[model samples]
Target chain A: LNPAGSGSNSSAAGIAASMVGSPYVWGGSSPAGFDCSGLTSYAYAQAGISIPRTAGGQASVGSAVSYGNMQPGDLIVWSGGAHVSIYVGGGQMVHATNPSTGVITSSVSFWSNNSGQSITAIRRP
Target chain B: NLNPAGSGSNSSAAGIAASMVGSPYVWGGSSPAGFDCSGLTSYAYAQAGISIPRTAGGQASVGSAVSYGNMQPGDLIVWSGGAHVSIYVGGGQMVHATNPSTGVITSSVSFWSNNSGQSITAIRRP
Candidate 1:
């Protein structure tokens, strides 16, 4: 059986990927849905990790990494600490975009390069 | 005197600066142990997860423009050039790693606005 309950050894990437089609709940962190921090904290929680609930709180929760050193399962806080997405490597990520978009995969630079929002950190929990 | 537990703006930014309220001021110091105005802003922004230029001028060059009336907690009130930098901690107050006097402390926003020729040169966010 999959060790879903023994979360410590679970894959963060796996959890993030598994929720690609989940619904978006504005303040939710459940496997059923989530927003920026909800999706991130939800995925990490499944890995048996407890992270902060809000953007700023989570920004300070992990050991930060440089962009050039990112890896699968890395937590990337962008939009100036206002948003969070899980790194799926190959310069891509999985996250619950907004109340309407739900969850989806996207290019890491989609917002930073196109919308001009700076990435505050690439952290590892 | 801002409540870091609050959200929005450069909210955590003010929290970061407020947390450094007991440090000492160094002429060119840029680290937490010894920081000047610009140094404090630089460190505070970094801790809050925003990477900005070290000098006050460089820091001022980036970030979107914010007006004084619209300033929020965590917004930066930079002095002209790169001489001094202070973190706006909301409610018409700020936190700067001032010179030998108090290192890092909270003060009124008018202190900078009222200083001779020290009018806040620019307001920005990280």
Candidate 2:
């Protein structure tokens, strides 16, 4: 299991790893395939944290935290609330992105203004 | 205004946000027409009956305080310096409405580090 301490427990890495070669679906959420939120929620489950089933609802739960104070297991949201991914430290985040790329690791700037949304909130369980 | 069925769980919120993965990105608008970064965040929480600020700065100010190390799925992560916002989805990733061309998408922290001036703040809403 990809526990939070190992960075493997987080949904981003876990789901990404599980679906290393899975096909991409526009709004999928299964092992065979996954959308952004499906990937995040499925991966977190591996670590034991049952997150909300959708991206927007996922944004509403948990206690909010400061971006400057983010740690290893923190989650970084973007585009107001349209998308979600897992933070795996070193300014890198794992997420199941668009069709062009399934699950992948990217820099924080990937979603910066050029992409669309900005950092809206950070939650903690 | 929180929905009993949708309230009290991160998965529920995630489910709501995930359902709209393919929605287009629209600025200064919310709902069927599409959503901007902050607009999407605001609308997602609204489904659970939770009312959050409409903009990134406003949303950042309304929530409670938490450290980066202690973040969870439903938390809010705001970036200052530029003019954008998103919701923390866990594992160092976030979800938000991009722009006219991109629509809604998920991005990593490096994306924010390169573009934003600084991490403005993270707020926890009641």
Candidate 3:
């Protein structure tokens, strides 16, 4: 069975992974395009869960965990809650970034190191 | 105030079309599973309780004439003499089955006009 059809953290992670090459649309929430929080919220919805729309509101849910303890399907926000992504394990996070980058998977450790943005919060929903 | 069916509204058709973004593009497909350009436009209208022809050219003839300058969300835009079709979705964007690689997507009207090498054949409100 397709993993994304199930309601689980892995399902959310899989759904996010399926949208890796989708475009970035301002205020978009569907496969047509996505903003950071839109991607996260959409993925969670497919997994039968609901989260807030904005990055800050999402940061408030799903019980916080230290960066070292983050798991797959975890919501990670940075730039003081201005950005968010779903942790897809293997040290990579999938996110809808700027229009130029669209949705992409990057080394979580590398992004944290080079982004000049500290983690605002990491939550497991 | 264009209505294909007494109960059908253009805005609902446009919203239904926009909701299919990211679906696959199959040559003869016309459902959530996949859709071609005309397939998408027809299916959207169908979902709103409006029925239209299956091909792009056929669809071009069913609606009342609309000029490009007067297009509104839910209007149908045709290109290449009905070779392709899209649903106008406000914000200068239209949703269509762009291609196999891009699948169903929302694109700027000017972006397609500038690159498609095809002129707008007609715009209609069904």
Candidate 4:
């Protein structure tokens, strides 16, 4: 089955995107709060999918995709696998960032600009 | 370091937070491990053996509404429509769990007001 064609995949992306302003809670995996991996895991879970609970674990799942082939709902892992976000297409991604900003829809380049790390992996789960 | 012991008084709450200056700001954190805005205030109250709501909005509703002039130490000052909350510590200062760059710290109330660009929606005395 094409990953993009899965209704769950689309729903996961929409769900993650909708949590743009949710609080960034450490070890939190519910709508009430989230960390980076927590946000992705929660979104996918809400879409009827069960994935790993951490960024490193989530990045290890599914099949790796080349950057050019990246699609909406793809999971992007940052260098060192410390951060994760859901690609919402149009060069944008959603993640439960930090205590300051919380969850936000940021341009993919925004992360690279703010941090020295670049995208290390893209997985379609 | 002598952490402020909760004396079950309003000023004690303020003193408790004042001692936590430099603590990291962690979302959903309520202990010395870290703290978000509401988490800091709620934890302070809890340390005093007082129970209060967890969220800023909920905390705002539980306490008696107080005007700026009527605010006392340990009063919760909610801003940005309850999106943020802080404890007034007198001397025109308040201690709050701020952002990642700046953790728990005391700042002049005016500094926060000017920096947040948000209005004080309510002040509560719990």
- Give DockQ for candidates 1 onward, in order: 0.03, 0.03, 0.03, 0.01
Docking class for model 4 is incorrect
Q: Give me the displacement of residue B114 in model 2, in angstroms.
A: 3.4
Per-residue alpha-carbon lDDT of model 2 for A1-125, expressed as tens digits? 12123322332343344344455687777656678777777665644467887877677766676765554445566765688876655676667787778777777665664776787766654
TM-score of chain B of each: 0.86, 0.79, 0.92, 0.90
Candidate 4 residue B17 Cα shift, in angstroms, is 44
Please give the lDDT score at residue A122 for candidate 4.
86
Candidate 3 per-residue lDDT, tens place, A16-99, comes to 776788899999888789999999998777555789999989988877777766666888998768789998877899999999
Candidate 4's C-alpha runs over 4 A off are: A1-5, B1-126
Model 1, chain B: what is the TM-score? 0.86
Residues A85-118 of candidate 1 have per-residue lDDT tens digits of 8887678888888767888889987877985677
- Give the Cα error of residue B82 in candidate 2, in Å: 8.2
Q: State which candidate has the highest DockQ.
A: 3
Each prediction's interface RMSD?
A: 13.8, 10.0, 10.9, 18.8
Candidate 2 has an lDDT of 0.61
Query: Which candidate number would show the highest lDDT if scored against the true structure?
Result: 3
Please report the TM-score between candidate 4 and the true structure: 0.48
Distance from true position, residue B51, model 3, in Å? 0.5
Cα lDDT, model 2, residue A112: 64
Name the TM-score of candidate 2. Answer: 0.45
Give lDDT tens digits, candidate 4, residues A68-120.
77676789999857899998778888899888989888888878788787887
